[PDB]
């Protein structure tokens, strides 16, 4: 017998209570990074580790640009919510 709330995983683009950013030309930062990390790592890294790579990428390589000073130069950190019980490998 196991918890009915187990084996769930929520990959959030941003932290609780915060805005999430998206570029009209390339797409959201979170999705870009996620797809990219999955492309080059789905064959060797465990899922949590891939998601950790996404966190660094989004947190390091992105920064909003806006003519509006209040939405300019803002950052973002994705949020991993794991309730998994086993490691996840796509291979």
């Amino acid at each position: 017998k196991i918890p009915v709330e187990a084996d769930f995983l929520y990959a959030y683009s941003t932290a609780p209570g915060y805005y999430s950013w998206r570029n009209s030309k390339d797409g959201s930062w979170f999705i870009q990074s996620l797809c990219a990390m999955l492309k080059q790592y789905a064959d060797k890294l465990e899922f949590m580790h891939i998601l950790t790579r996404v966190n660094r990428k989004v947190a390091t390589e992105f920064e909003s640009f806006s003519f509006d000073a209040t939405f300019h130069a803002k950052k973002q950190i994705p949020c991993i919510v794991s309730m998994l019980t086993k490691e996840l490998y796509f291979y």
């Binding site: 990959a11 915060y18 797409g27």
Partner: protein, 140 residues
């Protein structure tokens, strides 16, 4: 074993809900660039052997109905389940083209005791959305 069994005949289903346009009533701006994500995601999960199903501009009613329907499919031959939500939102909520829907209501269909064929299998939810209107100015 300390890793899920991913050798079922089918990798699993992957639903992508791509909301780009919203009713004036909601007051949400058009989500430009979301199509790139939808296209990107679709290609990425196809290479991972997931059966991808893309959906665009759904109302909160349609989203709930769809999830309900998907939770009722038989996943016995499937290894996992992946659902990507592209839309607006606030903490604990995601928007349908016509208004807010609680995130709890969508996932509850996949609980261990609600969707028996997915019990013991990984259920991944990827959410691209606002969880509030707070701004991270950065440091260092």
């Amino acid at each position: 074993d300390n890793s899920y069994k991913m050798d079922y005949p089918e990798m699993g289903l992957c639903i992508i809900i791509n909301n780009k346009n919203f009713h004036k009533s909601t007051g949400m701006t058009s989500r430009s660039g979301t199509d790139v994500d939808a296209a990107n995601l679709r290609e990425t999960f196809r290479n991972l052997k997931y059966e991808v199903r893309n959906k665009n501009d759904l109302t909160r009613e349609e989203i709930v109905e769809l999830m309900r329907d998907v939770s009722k499919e038989d996943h016995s031959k499937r290894s996992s389940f992946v659902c990507v939500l592209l839309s607006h939102g606030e903490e604990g909520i995601i928007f349908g083209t016509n208004g807010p829907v609680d995130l709890k209501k969508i996932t509850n269909f996949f609980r261990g005791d609600r969707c028996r064929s997915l019990t013991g299998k990984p259920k991944l939810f990827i959410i691209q959305a606002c969880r509030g209107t707070e701004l991270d100015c950065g440091i260092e």
